[PDB]
Design a protein around this ligand. Structure first.
Ligand SMILES: *[C@@H](CC(=O)OCC)[C@H](C[C@@H]1CCNC1=O)NC(=O)[C@H](Cc1ccccc1)NC(=O)[C@@H](NC(=O)OC(C)(C)C)[C@@H](C)OC(C)(C)C
Ligand SMILES: *[C@@H](CC(=O)OCC)[C@H](C[C@@H]1CCNC1=O)NC(=O)[C@H](Cc1ccccc1)NC(=O)[C@@H](NC(=O)OC(C)(C)C)[C@@H](C)OC(C)(C)C
Lengths: 188, 188
């Protein structure tokens, strides 16, 4: 059955509530002071983290080599606590998965777990009228309030929730190589 | 940690979505065609079960010997499927519990699980301005939409969610003796 225990360990040590001008989003902390949030949250130069105003030291809105939205934004945050390093739980490659859990951590739902079943590497989605790539799909009627929600199977953190149509839900993939310590590069 | 697996087995085989004039409620099926719902749902002589209109053959709004609301209504339903018999999972006595799960099954949330932590035998509550007895309390910010939600620990089904104040949640107890095959008695 679904890996509830794994989902809970991730939620407990690696999520915070983030709030931007667009509202609240579950936020996954990946390592150090680096976390993720859906690009459509519109992160600015400060953000609320568990209701504490926090400087956004860096925000990278990921796009692929076709210059298409991946709907993941990586943020670096000015705060004292380091996130437990969970990069070894990120998949190396695109993939399909079984029996996934979607976990939410907001003010309305400080801790909630939803078995969404099979998750398929879906690819392209015209999300909200923005072309988007590398989407995961699950047949579950996901709702507003669930964006940023963490999609896991046992031992893997596979994506964050970004969208739905009333019958399916959509997550943006997380891949290991998004977070490897890397390259000297002017990015803004 | 929380008994997610037990909660899921109960949700899968023993809950349906019920809808009355008051809206939708998770509904626990106990045995045969007998289920429960919060008294404040106002069950009439028909009710929707998974969107199918269904005759309510009997509805008993439980009160204790002080003539106080217990907020449980037992209903007998005209339908073909029997519920798996889960009476052996109901506690014999009032009690406090550890590490409980609140599980919801509505149209908005067809399957969702919330660790609510410790559950205490609270007793009296002026619920919605109606004196109510035999209440369980948990420190979790439960919401509208969660009434009827099933509160479990491993191996026990302990109550159904009925109320909250924005910081705590409240369940009405379920006891084994509510459902024992019993006594010739004019009840309406
Ligand atoms: C999370 C963010 C949120 O609630 O705030 C909006 C500012 C929601 C989650 C989904 C809404 C409906 N069910 C869900 O699971 N995401 C969104 O609203 C997406 C845009 C977004 C905004 C902020 C952050 C991240 C994403 N938009 C959608 O999901 C739209 N879906 C969609 O376009 O799907 C296809 C048509 C491409 C299949 C929704 C809002 O659009 C409708 C399907 C309702 C028309
Ligand atoms: C479930 C039913 C529902 O959503 O529909 C209303 C028709 C809700 C769940 C709780 C609401 C707020 N958070 C919850 O966890 N229950 C209720 O609304 C209770 C009445 C009810 C109606 C239908 C079926 C079953 C029950 N009422 C309450 O929970 C009230 N709580 C309350 O009175 O608590 C004390 C003051 C006694 C501590 C809420 C609505 O009242 C306020 C606290 C908002 C003033």
């Amino acid at each position: 059955g679904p890996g509830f225990d794994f989902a809970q360990a991730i939620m407990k040590k690696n999520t915070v509530v983030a709030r931007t001008e667009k509202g609240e989003f579950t936020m996954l902390g990946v390592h150090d002071r680096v976390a993720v949030i859906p690009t459509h949250a519109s992160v600015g130069e400060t953000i609320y983290i568990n209701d504490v105003e926090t400087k956004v030291l860096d925000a990278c809105a990921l796009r692929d080599l076709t210059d298409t939205n991946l709907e993941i934004t990586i943020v670096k945050l000015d705060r004292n606590q380091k996130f437990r390093d969970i990069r070894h739980f990120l998949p190396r490659y695109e993939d399909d998965y079984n029996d996934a859990v979607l976990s939410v951590h907001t003010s309305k739902f400080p801790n909630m777990y939803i078995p969404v079943g099979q998750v398929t590497n879906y690819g392209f989605l015209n999300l909200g009228g923005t072309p988007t790539h590398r989407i995961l799909m699950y047949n579950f009627p996901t709702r507003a309030g669930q964006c940023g929600g963490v999609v896991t199977t046992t031992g893997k953190v596979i994506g964050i929730h970004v969208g739905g149509n009333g019958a399916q839900g959509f997550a943006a993939m997380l891949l290991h190589s998004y977070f490897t310590d890397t390259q000297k590069h002017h990015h803004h």
